[PDB]
Amino acid sequence: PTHLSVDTKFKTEGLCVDIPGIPKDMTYRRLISMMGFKMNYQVNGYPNMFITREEAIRHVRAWIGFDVEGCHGTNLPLQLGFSTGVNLVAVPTPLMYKGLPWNVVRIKIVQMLSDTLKNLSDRVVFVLWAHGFELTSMKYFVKIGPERTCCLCDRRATCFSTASDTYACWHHSIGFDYVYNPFMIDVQQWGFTGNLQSNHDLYCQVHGNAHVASCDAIMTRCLAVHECFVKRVDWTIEYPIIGDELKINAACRKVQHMVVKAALLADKFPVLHDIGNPKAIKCVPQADVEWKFYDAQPCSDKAYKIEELFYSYHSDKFTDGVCLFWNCNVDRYPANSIVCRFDTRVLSNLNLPGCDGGSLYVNKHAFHTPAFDKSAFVNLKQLPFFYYSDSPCESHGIDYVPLKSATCITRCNLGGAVCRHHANEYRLYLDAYNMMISAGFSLWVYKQFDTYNLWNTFT
Ligand SMILES: CCN(CC)c1cc(C)nc2ncnn12
Ligand SMILES: CCN(CC)c1cc(C)nc2ncnn12
Ligand SMILES: [Zn+2]
Ligand SMILES: [Zn+2]
Ligand SMILES: [Zn+2]
The per-residue DSSP string of 132-180 comes to: SHHHHHGGGTEE--S--B-SSSSSBP-EEETTTTEEE-SSS-TT--EEE
Which helix (DSSP H) or strand (DSSP E) does residue 79 occupy? strand 78-82
Is 425 close to ligand 2, i.e. is its CB under 6 Å away? no
Per the CB < 8 A criterion, the answer to whether 91 and 100 are in contact is: yes
Distance CA 138, CA 204 (A): 29
Q: Any known ligand binding at 150?
A: yes
Per the CB < 8 A criterion, the answer to whether 457 and 355 are in contact is: no
107: DSSP letter:
H
How is the chain split into domains, by residue range? Answer: 13-147+180-230, 245-457
Which helix (DSSP H) or strand (DSSP E) does residue 443 occupy? strand 441-446
Distance CA 35, CA 68 (A): 14
The bridge status of strand 322-326 relative to strand 271-276 is parallel
8: DSSP letter:
S
Per the CB < 8 A criterion, the answer to whether 207 and 73 are in contact is: no
Burial string for 147-159 (b: 16+ CB within 10 Å, else e) reads ebebeeeeebbbb
- CA 62-64-69 angle, 5° bins: 160
Per the CB < 8 A criterion, the answer to whether 241 and 121 are in contact is: no
Using alpha carbons, list the distances in angstroms from residue 364 to 239, 367, 423: 5, 10, 32
Q: Any known ligand binding at 283?
A: no
E strands, 233-372, where? Answer: 271-276, 290-295, 322-326, 337-342, 351-353, 359-363, 365-369
Distance CA 347, CA 367 (A): 16
- CA 248-250-252 angle, 5° bins: 70
**67 among known catalytic residues:** yes
137 Cβ neighbours under 8 A, 6+ residues apart: 68, 78, 80, 90
Distance CA 264, CA 289 (A): 8
Cα–chain-centroid distance for residue 3? 24
Give the resolution value in Å.
2.0
Distance CA 195, CA 204 (A): 15
Q: Is 415 helix (H, G, I), strand (E, B) or coil?
A: coil
Is 136 close to ligand 1, i.e. is its CB under 6 Å away? yes
Ligand 1, atom 2: closest residue by C-alpha: 73
Of the ligands numbered here, which is closest to the C-alpha atom of 79? 2
Is 237 close to ligand 1, i.e. is its CB under 6 Å away? no
Nearest one of 10, 256, 221 to 116, comparing CA atoms: 221
Nearest one of 184, 202, 179, 156 to 31, comparing CA atoms: 184
Residue from 136, 139, 141, 142 whose mutation best tests the ligand 1 pocket (most atoms within 8 A of CB)? 136
Per the CB < 8 A criterion, the answer to whether 203 and 223 are in contact is: yes
Which amino acid does the sequence have at 454? L
Q: What is the DSSP string of 168-237?
A: E-SSS-TT--EEES-EEEEGGGG---S-HHHHHTTT-SSS---SSHHHHHHHHHHHHHIIIIISS--SS-
Residue from 75, 91, 102 whose mutation best tests the ligand 2 pocket (most atoms within 8 A of CB)? 75
Nearest one of 34, 30, 24, 109 to 68, comparing CA atoms: 109
Per the CB < 8 A criterion, the answer to whether 69 and 213 are in contact is: yes
Give me the half-sphere count of Cα atoms (radius 13 Å) on the Cβ side of residue 450. Answer: 5
Distance CA 445, CA 448 (A): 8
Nearest one of 184, 145, 237, 222 to 51, comparing CA atoms: 184
Is 19 close to ligand 2, i.e. is its CB under 6 Å away? yes
Which numeric CATH code is attached to 13-147+180-230? Answer: 3.30.420
Nearest one of 225, 433, 212 to 340, comparing CA atoms: 433
Chain breaks after residues in the chain, where C lies over 2.5 Å from next N: 72, 93, 313, 397
Using alpha carbons, list the distances in angstroms from residue 177 to 9, 32, 122, 258: 32, 21, 18, 52
Distance CA 68, CA 76 (A): 12
For residue 176, report the phi and psi dihedrals to the nearest 5 degrees: -75, 150
Of the ligands numbered here, which is closest to the C-alpha atom of 102? 2
Which helix (DSSP H) or strand (DSSP E) does residue 64 occupy? strand 63-70
Nearest one of 393, 397, 396 to 410, comparing CA atoms: 393
Distance CA 253, CA 337 (A): 18
Q: Which atom of ligand 1 is nearest to the CA of 74?
A: 5
**356 among known catalytic residues:** no
Which amino acid does the sequence have at 218? I
Handedness of CA 350, 352, 354, 357 (dihedral sign): positive
Distance CA 335, CA 445 (A): 8
Nearest one of 362, 437, 354 to 119, comparing CA atoms: 362
**Gap from CA of 443 to ligand 5 centroid (Å):** 26
Q: Given 134, 186, 227, 244, which residue is catalytic?
A: 134
Cα–chain-centroid distance for residue 92? 37
**308 among known catalytic residues:** no
Using alpha carbons, list the distances in angstroms from residue 195 to 13, 14, 243, 338, 413: 12, 9, 38, 44, 65
Which helix (DSSP H) or strand (DSSP E) does residue 349 occupy? none
62: DSSP letter:
G
Distance CA 70, CA 92 (A): 12
In this structure, how many other beta carbons lie within 10 angstroms of the beta carbon of residue 27?
14
Distance CA 321, CA 430 (A): 28
Angle, helix 420-438 to helix 245-267, in steps of 10 degrees: 110
Per the CB < 8 A criterion, the answer to whether 246 and 435 are in contact is: no
**390 among known catalytic residues:** no
User: What experiment produced this structure?
Assistant: X-ray
Distance CA 262, CA 257 (A): 8
Nearest one of 229, 235, 195 to 358, comparing CA atoms: 229
